[PDB]
């Protein structure tokens, strides 16, 4: 089958409109998306925090027993430890012991977008990068932090024995589609699907998110 649909002509045009539009509110559901933000979905552009946040919340609402944190989660966890993110789970109206997965979009050095996947059932923490040179210091750190997070959040009941892995995923053909690939990996991860997508699937993602935004998908 396929996880990212092809838009019908009316839906793809609505997107086109909004992209060529000069308009301060396409959406407000607590994520306000503007044409300015929307335009980062436009082709060849760097996807911004707001659009990731949107997609993440979409995934949450469209996936049982799943939490998909925004990109500021990892920044706070990294700079301030667990104490800097200790209420974030409670705010999700759930408990960590009651989840299948936890997604964490990661903005490395403000440009490079990557993905952390905590799979509580599989007992793994994966680092997924679409511009991967291989294991490195930052990926190691990400895995270590996410593990620490699990260990704390769970009041030290789970996480200490998790497999800390580097998950292969499809590699982007350019230096700007990181955001999209993160979204792609999140969607697939959420469906427990192998990360076997291609670049054509990825470009369709841009239109899809755009569609989702314009159709008030979070509602």
Curated annotation (Swiss-Prot):
Coiled coil: none
Active-site positions on this chain: 112, 129, 178
Top-level taxon of the source organism: Eukaryota
Residue span of region Protease: 30-219
Family named by the database record: Belongs to the peptidase C48 family.
Function statement: Protease that catalyzes two essential functions in the SUMO pathway: processing of full-length SMT3 to its mature form and deconjugation of SMT3 from targeted proteins. Has an essential role in the G2/M phase of the cell cycle.
Note: Present with 377 molecules/cell in log phase SD medium.
Protein name: Ubiquitin-like-specific protease 1
Organism in which the protein naturally occurs: Saccharomyces cerevisiae (strain ATCC 204508 / S288c)
Taxonomy of the source species: Eukaryota, Fungi, Dikarya, Ascomycota, Saccharomycotina
Name of the gene this protein is made from: ULP1
């Amino acid at each position: 089958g396929s996880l990212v649909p092809e838009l019908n002509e009316k839906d793809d045009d609505q997107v086109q409109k909004a992209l060529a539009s000069r308009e301060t509110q396409l959406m407000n559901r607590n994520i306000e998306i503007t044409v300015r933000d929307f335009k980062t979905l436009a082709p060849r552009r760097w996807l911004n925090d707001t659009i990731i946040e949107f997609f993440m919340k979409y995934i949450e609402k469209s996936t049982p027993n799943t939490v998909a944190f925004n990109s500021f989660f990892y920044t706070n966890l990294s700079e301030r430890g667990y104490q800097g993110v200790r209420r974030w789970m409670k705010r999700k109206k759930t408990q960590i012991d009651k989840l299948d997965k936890i997604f964490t979009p990661i903005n490395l050095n403000q440009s490079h977008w990557a993905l952390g996947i905590i799979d509580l059932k599989k007992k793994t923490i994966g680092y997924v990068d679409s511009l991967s040179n291989g294991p490195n210091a930052m990926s190691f750190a990400i895995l270590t932090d996410l593990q620490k997070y699990v260990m704390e959040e769970s009041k030290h009941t789970i996480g200490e024995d998790f497999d800390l892995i580097h998950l292969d995923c499809p590699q982007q053909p350019n230096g700007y589609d990181c955001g999209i690939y993160v979204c792609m990996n999140t969607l697939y991860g959420s469906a427990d699907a192998p990360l076997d997508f291609d670049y054509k699937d990825a470009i369709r993602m841009r239109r899809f998110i755009a569609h989702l935004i314009l159709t008030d998908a979070l509602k």
